């Protein structure tokens, strides 16, 4: 749909859409930019991720409201509307996963880009898992786990323990273990080890990098406080 707009114009409009809090537009501009076929810079990857996290975040919040109403009620309206929101959410997750598969991941050779995209892949399978039931749920859960694990393996070999993408990946994989995989001990162990190894590497950082790393470390600590 964005085929006639220049790549640079799509990027500029995605930044404007963010300022205007128009996240659906932002995601559509960034989808258009990905479909130009060129790799994304660090800032462009962040725009893609921010756009879709906002879109799916609002869908997830709505799905949770409707699922709670439906569970309390247990006419067809609540289930029908929860199903409509669920299908829309699944469609957005499938769209992001399709961008990652065609062809962002395969072209990502540097650790920073490949880890970022595999973390995204884990996240969007995790959002699919949140609404999945039964056996479909098992394969979706394993797809999230596999993406996160590959990202973890690369991150531990190629990035310092304070790298913000490495830290956010570990945070989100710990949430996966706690909330999706029914592995709270694995969640706690990953969050603790990640926090401690980052603490021991803070001395190497500038003041600005210190601020970025400690912000995510606080999120790990916030979860550990809630889980223990």
């Amino acid at each position: 749909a964005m085929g006639s707009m220049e790549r640079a114009s799509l990027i500029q409009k995605a930044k404007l859409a963010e300022q205007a809090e128009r996240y659906e537009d932002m995601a559509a501009f960034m989808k258009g930019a990905v479909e130009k076929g060129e790799e994304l810079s660090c800032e462009e990857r962040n725009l893609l991720s921010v756009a879709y996290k906002n879109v799916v975040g609002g869908q997830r919040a709505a799905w949770r409201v409707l699922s709670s109403i439906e569970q309390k009620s247990n006419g067809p309206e609540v289930r029908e509307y929860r199903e409509k929101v669920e299908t829309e959410l699944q469609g957005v997750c499938d769209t992001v996963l399709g961008l990652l598969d065609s062809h962002l991941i395969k072209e990502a050779g540097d650790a920073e880009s490949r880890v970022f995209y595999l973390k995204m892949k884990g996240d969007y399978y995790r959002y699919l898992a949140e609404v999945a039931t039964g056996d479909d749920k098992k394969r979706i859960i394993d797809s999230a786990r596999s993406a996160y694990q590959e990202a973890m393996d690369i991150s531990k070999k190629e990035m310092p323990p304070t790298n913000p993408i490495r830290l956010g990946l570990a945070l989100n994989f710990s949430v996966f273990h706690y909330e999706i995989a029914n592995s709270p001990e694995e969640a706690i162990s990953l969050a603790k080890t990640t926090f401690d190894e980052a603490m021991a590497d803070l001395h190497t950082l500038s003041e600005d990098s210190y601020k970025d790393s400690t912000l995510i470390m606080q999120l790990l600590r916030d979860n550990l406080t809630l889980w223990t």
Binding site: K53, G57, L171, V175, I216, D222
Partner: peptide, 9 residues
């Protein structure tokens, strides 16, 4: 449990 908010560039 909180994941990365990730909603502001």
């Amino acid at each position: 449990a909180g994941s990365i908010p990730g909603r502001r560039s």
